Amino acid sequence: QVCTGTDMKLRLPASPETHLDMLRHLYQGCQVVQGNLELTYLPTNASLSFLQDIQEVQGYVLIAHNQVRQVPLQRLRIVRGTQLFEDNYALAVLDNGDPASPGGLRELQLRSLTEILKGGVLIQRNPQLCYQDTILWKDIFHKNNQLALTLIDTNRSRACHPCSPMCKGSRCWGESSEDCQSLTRTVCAGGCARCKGPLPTDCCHEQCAAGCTGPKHSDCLACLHFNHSGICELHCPALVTYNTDTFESMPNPEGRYTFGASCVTACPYNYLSTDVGSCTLVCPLHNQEVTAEDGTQRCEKCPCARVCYGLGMEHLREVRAVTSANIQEFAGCKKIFGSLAFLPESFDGDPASNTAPLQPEQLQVFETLEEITGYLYISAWPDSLPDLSVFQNLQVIRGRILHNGAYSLTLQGLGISWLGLRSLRELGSGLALIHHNTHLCFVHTVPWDQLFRNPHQALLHTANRPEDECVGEGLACHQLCARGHCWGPGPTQCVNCSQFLRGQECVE
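Structure for Receptor tyrosine-protein kinase erbB-2,Green fluorescent protein, as requested:
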């Protein structure tokens, strides 16, 4: 029921062909989206009904380059705006249409949208879109959301029918009466931030956001800060309380962690329990990730060990791929904190600095790697390597950082005949995508679902070597493989053995 969005922005999907299923797998059944919610480059005939469940977005909401006439986000109530589009917009709609009926967005239909916590609104170049200019946006922007930008492009090729006659003030998201925007902020008697009506008795509890059922902290539709079992509070109750005469620690049975905008009893899988009582993915400076014997993580004081970092972290924040100039940074690593990527640039080198192209022996630095905290993206690989076995010892991909905010594992355009990633056991989060891997077999010979740890993640694949061809050539799994499942040819590539093992070999 809770999932994250992506970070593709206005960039084309790596595999547009599977993009709609990606969204389907990610969002069907998801009420709350962490991070930003982005729908970009979707076709006219896309079916997006799986988005009908979304109620809240932690970050910004972006609709762009879609030819989609309708986007079923009418249930959305609040945009929290942790990140803004172009650092300014909580919500933005761009280029959703064509230059038989034309494609492009016609209505927003955000009838349940009541609030923008922070950030403005940007609507541009959407020639088929109506009523973007009727919404009394100042009523939606939070009281303290003074970045009340309304960059609304009203240049439309499509004529707009007036808003249903039942809409007071003709403020609507679409023609229907149901698409009329209720005014609940600038119309409140008593001067309260939010209300249900013209009376002061209609005022929402002061700790409430995006509207209410009443004046109590137990009467809100969405909390300003945290939702503790339906109760709105500034913060989650402390995990430990104190007797200040002696400063005795008293773990609080009612104490909760802060995650998202709600209170939890424990951090979600792959999240770390901080000393703060917050759930993170990344520890504060001078704290380290510690894994408990029960498999969960926490941030604890570190004194501090040298830590191996990947792309997206520390001095590698600006680095897009591992280059030949970065290899030594992984020497001696078992766990890398960050992402890795092997893109043509890695293998082309860098004429601006005359960096040599990455050689296959330099990838040996990763043979000792057991865990990556970020994502792995390969779009280029030496053709001398028939597989990705240099990472055969990689057991865990956590997906803390996702490629374009979506993938924890992506492989594309490769000549590898098999993956060979025999140690992989878990894909902690994120999507996996295999595409255009012209010569790659053993795609459906892997019980892929066994390494997925969430209903909101799945393996997507397209245009790879057809299994039909792999089958015709006998690129089948060894008869001693559990379930007939493997990562590549031979007794050593089995996901598990039905037999005794000798080294990597299933033997009988």
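The two ends are 45 Å apart (CA to CA).
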